[PDB]
Design a protein around this nucleic acid. Sequence first.
RNA 1: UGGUAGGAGU
DNA 2: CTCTGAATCTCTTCCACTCCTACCAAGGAC
DNA 3: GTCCGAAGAGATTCAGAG
Lengths: 613, 1316
Amino acid sequence: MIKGKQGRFRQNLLGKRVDYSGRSVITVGPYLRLHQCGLPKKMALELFKPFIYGKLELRGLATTIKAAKKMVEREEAVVWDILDEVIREHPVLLNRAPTLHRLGIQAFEPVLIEGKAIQLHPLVCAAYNADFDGDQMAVHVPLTLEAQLEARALMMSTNNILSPANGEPIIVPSQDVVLGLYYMTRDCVNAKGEGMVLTGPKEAERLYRSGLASLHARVKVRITEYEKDANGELVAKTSLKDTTVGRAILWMIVPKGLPYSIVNQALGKKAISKMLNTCYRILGLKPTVIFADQIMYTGFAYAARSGASVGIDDMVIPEKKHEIISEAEAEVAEIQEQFQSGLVTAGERYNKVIDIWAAANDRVSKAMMDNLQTETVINRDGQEEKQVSFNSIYMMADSGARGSAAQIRQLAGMRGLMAKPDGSIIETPITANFREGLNVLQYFISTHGARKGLADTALKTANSGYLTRRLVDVAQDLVVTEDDCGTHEGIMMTPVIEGGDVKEPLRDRVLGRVTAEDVLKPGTADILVPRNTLLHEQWCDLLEENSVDAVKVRSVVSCDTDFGVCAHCYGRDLARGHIINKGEAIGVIAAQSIGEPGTQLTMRSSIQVKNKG
Amino acid sequence: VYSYTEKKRIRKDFGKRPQVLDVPYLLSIQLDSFQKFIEQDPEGQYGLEAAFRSVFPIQSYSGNSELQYVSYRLGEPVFDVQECQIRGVTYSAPLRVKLRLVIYEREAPEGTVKDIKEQEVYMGEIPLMTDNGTFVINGTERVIVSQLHRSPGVFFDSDKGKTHSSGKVLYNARIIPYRGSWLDFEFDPKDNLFVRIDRRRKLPATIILRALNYTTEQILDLFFEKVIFEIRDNKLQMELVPERLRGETASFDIEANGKVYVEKGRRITARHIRQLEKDDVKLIEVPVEYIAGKVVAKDYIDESTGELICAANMELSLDLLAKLSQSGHKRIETLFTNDLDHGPYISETLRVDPTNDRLSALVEIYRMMRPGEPPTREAAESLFENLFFSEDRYDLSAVGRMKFNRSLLREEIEGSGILSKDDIIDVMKKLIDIRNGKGEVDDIDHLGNRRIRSVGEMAENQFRVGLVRVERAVKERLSLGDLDTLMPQDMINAKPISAAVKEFFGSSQLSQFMDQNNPLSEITHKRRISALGPGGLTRERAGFEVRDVHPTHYGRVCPIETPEGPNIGLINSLSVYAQTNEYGFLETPYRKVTDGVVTDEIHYLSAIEEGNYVIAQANSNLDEEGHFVEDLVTCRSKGESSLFSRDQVDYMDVSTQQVVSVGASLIPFLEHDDANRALMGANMQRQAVPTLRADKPLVGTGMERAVAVDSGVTAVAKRGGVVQYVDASRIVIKVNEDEMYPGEAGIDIYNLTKYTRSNQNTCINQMPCVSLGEPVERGDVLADGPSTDLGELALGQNMRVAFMPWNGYNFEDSILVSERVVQEDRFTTIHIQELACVSRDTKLGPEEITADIPNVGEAALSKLDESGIVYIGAEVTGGDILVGKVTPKDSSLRVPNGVSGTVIDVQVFTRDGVEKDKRALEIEEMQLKQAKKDLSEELQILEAGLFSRIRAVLVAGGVEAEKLDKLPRDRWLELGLTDEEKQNQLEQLAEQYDELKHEFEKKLEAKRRKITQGDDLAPGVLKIVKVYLAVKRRIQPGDKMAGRHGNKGVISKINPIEDMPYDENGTPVDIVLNPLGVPSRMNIGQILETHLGMAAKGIGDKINAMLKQQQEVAKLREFIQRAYDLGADVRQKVDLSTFSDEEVMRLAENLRKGMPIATPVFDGAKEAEIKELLKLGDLPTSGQIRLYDGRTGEQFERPVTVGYMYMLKLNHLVDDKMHARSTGSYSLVTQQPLGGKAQFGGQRFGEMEVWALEAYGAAYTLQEMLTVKSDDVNGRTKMYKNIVDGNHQMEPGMPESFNVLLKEIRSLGINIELED
RNA sequence: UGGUAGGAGU
DNA sequence: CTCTGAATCTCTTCCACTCCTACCAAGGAC
DNA sequence: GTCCGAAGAGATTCAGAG
Ligand SMILES: [Mg+2]
């Protein structure tokens, strides 16, 4: 009763159960701001009971604690007014059942709602890995004043913009907002209101609302664009631009600093993420939060207005599929006939059959994709013309909202060859797609791999959990203690070249890390970078122009400080644009960042140069 | 022709393939196994009789007594199934056995026994199986899932390259008896055979042979060929058969008859082998260096002195052959060892083992088996004799012996249960042949190697385990000297058997608690096949390969239906047509294929026999004559599928749906969605809480009727007839004369079970689906159970569904439901709870249940009656007092918080001997009057039926139109009849009815006694009060709702009716889904399902318009005929001309709200048929309608899919999930218990959460969570006092868990000190 | 109550 | 025949949060 | 009224070899 998971050490000493906590199913709320979260009235009343008692005693409605308890149990009218005051600015901690990230627990400012479900912000759910399908989330109430300040300063969702694992943003439009933005920022060859010249974005919105102009009509709109050429000052630039109505409408929510070039494109998921990162780089944090909320609202509204839908006529089967299948079957029959005479061995026959079927699958997929992407043909002002299709499935695939090339290939093309449980490839692939039927044998062959993948995931979870626990414990003690060691030893940063293209660009590895020794300019007897300067975007860009391969960089293993590392060796915090603060628990952050992608990781001549040099 | 239940609503059925074999009885496995276990089965085989006959002959050590059983019988159960469920007692039947005891005369067993005793004995209670296949053990229905395990026999595991890092394969053989000790044979890296008994340490394999009194020469003869060498005058010529040496290089020059045929240093090919065989020169000459390599075989002794020149297994040498030359022996034996063909594996083992005699091997075996004990010759001999050749300790079942012989390629099927020396030798020879490359290993996952062990076999094994100890006790008692002292009743004890059976049936890994939320769940739970349990794998031990799906699972075990999670693949459901073999393996039907013709007769093929044949696919064109038109019909040969000629095929699949389970086959368009989503949908159908009103699915597979009738939920008429009397509580059927038995002909009465709590706390009720006077036949459903509609499985409701994003309310999987869904209460579910109160006998006086409760308001007592019990029908709420329960000194049972439902009934159980309170008197008198009313009503109705059937006899010339009326009311059976002997028959029947009503009143008195008698209770409690609350749940945000194709979701917002999107006609859509869920997880079944649902509802709306206004029957009939004749080549073929022109009206009435459509799993409607059906109505072919926004009023672009989809409400409610806590109870470690909502628990702040808390750098929050909210009791009270005063300080203190750990470590003699 | 399994959800 | 290598056995650990439903456990003898 | 798999690391031993 001391050792093991059931012992005191793991169950009780490190896993104490906490009062002032609750649990309920979560559901999406698009009305919420980024920092807010829904909270049922009954749950809020139960969690904040001592605060309600104290407020009742202070106000004077209840003389004694027993009277206040009875009044609260009666849930009288006055109790709700008192409650609204209490939870007005009191953050609550929300966490999911598996807590892999540092971001697995976040603080929100709660709003009283009716019901029994916690309303969560759609953008936040990406970090939580929440799916809104019976998912549950526990809430905790920080009592002490220090705890409240601490949650507000560190744990609030508005603070967690960049993940500690890497500098990429952790909030991003994901499923419907990105689809709405992609639908809005698109062009049609002929549409209502084409050729118009507009005064500004407000005119574009007025035209689209009144129905005179379509959301995709190409027009010429005067755009007021602000660029911060001066240090801390913005200069307006006004010019006529060839953009659609939808792009002009979206320009209203964009902040002042950003250029207009970002909105003019088709705005897929990568484009939206890049735009948010650009806003974070230029205008800071508060404009980025406001911009994220505006983007989510606008995307939801215009996705709803679009009325995108999936139907059995959306998935089109290429007309050449039957001919390709017939040719492949003829070739495989010919190879089998050659094998019957004994001319070709069984192993080479099997390999040739596999190659033939792979080639046929590639041809079918390419033909289907070519028929799909440019399926729509628009007649404009007389002569016909070609354009990117408006097929709903293709619109879902292109925008990155959902699906991929493989999913479409399975929906409207050959499912390809399926492996046996042992790992060998079945000779005959699944010819039929999911739009048309699958006979029993093909379904069995599919079920093989489906069950194998399900078991793989079910055990991957536990293996990754164990690895994460070991990593967290092996590196618990590390904390940034000192500020500078003054050491000269360091490791050498060079891009990794595995006999081909650059696997990792040099600027990516050395970004945010200080140098152990002064970097030497390609011009001899000259130094590009000082000895102890921290490399950032600008310093890396200056390093890009000279393009020196080898740069010595201070690292954690070379740190000479005992019982901890200095702030300079670690470098950037990767979550904020700052050198790491003293007292940061870098060991736990590192272990959690390593262990988080573990669930994704499955268990089971002549040398010629491509380019001149 | 169609059944009467089919006439009222006949489901349109697609599907071109005409089924040859109908779906068998769904629960046949459980019922058949239990019937085999416990029934009068002579000759032995398997059953209770076999278990009795195996053991009961008694041998006494000089006891001179023989005890044996004659027969066994089962007593009538004391209580009916409902009575056992209500009382909470097991539904068992006493086991009465006629045992006989015979003792011979002293020093004279040859003659007749001096005393012969025969007396029936009572042995124990065997829990009988209900009609549906369930067991009632303590008033709760339980099911015994059949277990799947490795079949007894011998297996040869490869063990390929796991160790030694050298890539060598360490072949091994394993023998698994049904009951005994495992015997293993292993190959060491040095090519040495090792034996391990019961997974003990390794031991040389030849020790077993030496322990089998086998001479070393005999072992060499068995495991090696003999090469004869002879001593001759001319070079001491060797004898060498040419056939012995094939394909090996010859170091010596091969000269036969002088001429050289094969030169030295050259290999021999086939031509030289054949040349030498033709020459047949067995004699040959070799250099004296060649013989030195060989090893002698037999013992050679010098005739001059008798000493051993060379013992067996001794390598020859120059001095050895010189001594043999001095010996003058004319025969030299050398073991034929060829590295490529044979192997010196046995010889090296004999070289390694130290034993050289039987006694040495025996003492080595004793040392290994029982270390530490000194070796005794007799003890070791007895141990080895009892290990593998004693019937009691070791036995191979008939299945085990059959598998063993089949693996050893023996023709004999049945043999001795115990092993034999020849069997072990053959196993070792087979392992050696496997090593040499002649043979193949056996795969464990092969379904021919795994077996099905149902409830009957496991219950029989448990009964045998219980019986052996009673047999031992009887033998021990018989050792005492006695003669005719006692009957053979006190000798045996019922307690061991009773305990051995009760423990298995109540506390076992496979005696699972039934879930009764659906008829489908009940069916599936009885069809489960769990690989876990006793004598099976565990979750941790089970490997990666076991969870995978084998190619032999086709037609036996469902590849789809299996629980995702920890035990994935370890638990899986039996397929539809698969029925277990008589030995225990799994079988599946197949249509025999004659010469080019597919016939009708069906052969059930096991796993092994399926490999040899060539089996066609279900989806192949037959054209009603056989002779598959394509000459390359796809067939699956042994473990592989490839095209074959139409004449090469030998068997055919019986039907398309013979692969999937029953649960997974309910999904329409199963062939259009990914296997993962199909698995999810199959698992989610089993968690659909039944709704307030059952609604049949508009589109379904078509087997829902079969799974509805084959479960016990619906009441099915056993004998057809007319409905004399129907009522919400019961149905009375007047049986037709032909089906009516002659003797004491009567009318059967069906009593429906009204609202009753299920295992999942859901309501179970029967609704009468027949009217007054409506004729019924045998096998039609009379009453609809939970979640069934007119005999069709109605799991959920079908509602209009639109696939479009809507303002982010359906973001990832959320679902937006119109308020119209809530308004018409079409997802409301009833929930029945059970609250029990016990009058415990504590100290300071017994606890009493009385009305007056000290220090409470009169309002609480107002709801209670004068006896302290809650009135039936009172609208109680959380906290309201239900019973008095006053304790001497207060603690009154009350409704838990968050519960608000009417109390439907209260049941009071009172200890025999104590007084009854006034409410107890009211309950008992009401129940007694109810029993009297039931008996009187059944008696009067049966009397009416019998006296009416007597009138039929009186009709034949014995009565007139007025004679019966003028006759008095007491003697209708007494009337002047023409036959004058059937009058005597009528008098006999009148006397029989007189005695029958005497029997009825006697059974009424027995029922009164059963109510009057003090029902048994556990010691320490006077009375038990059970209060049943019935809360009516309603849909709300946070509830989980799911479809059939694995597209689960949670309700997000109850949108107002006017805000929902509406089409041109103004009808709002009930639910809007999210389109993004389809492309990623490929489940196109729902899109096709919703298109077909729109088509069905379009047909329904067309006939509703044809019915709302008065239309002539001809027009409606011809439209329905057009709808039913839509399929291009469907097999349904309904003609409405044969209908009665009034049943057409009833069919139209039942179809006005929808046109049911059947689409089998792999033979469903194609897209073209759906488009044609849509065109039959006035609907667009594309299936997409232009919808207008509810609030803006502006029409959406991009026409949006709209249709009717069958949606389920899952048992994952939200009011049962939401929980909160500020301050409550604490444990011994002063942490909060977290019994969840049960005892107001706090959510656990796990280990992985403090990592995230401290990764943020948040120290103060971590400190408060670790100390002030969990363990610091002083910190807890100080923080609570500070909060109410407006202060938010914090005293850290020390957690109590740390002090507990300190004391725990100090308790082991280790000094822990917080030194300063 | 408390320790065990049993099934299920993420 | 000491003494680096290889055989054996032997211990330890295999995610994290819930929803619950049961099974379980010291007397008559002195 | 009172009492008697499976994977790895590691410790131990053991067989080869000079
Ligand atoms: Mg989820």
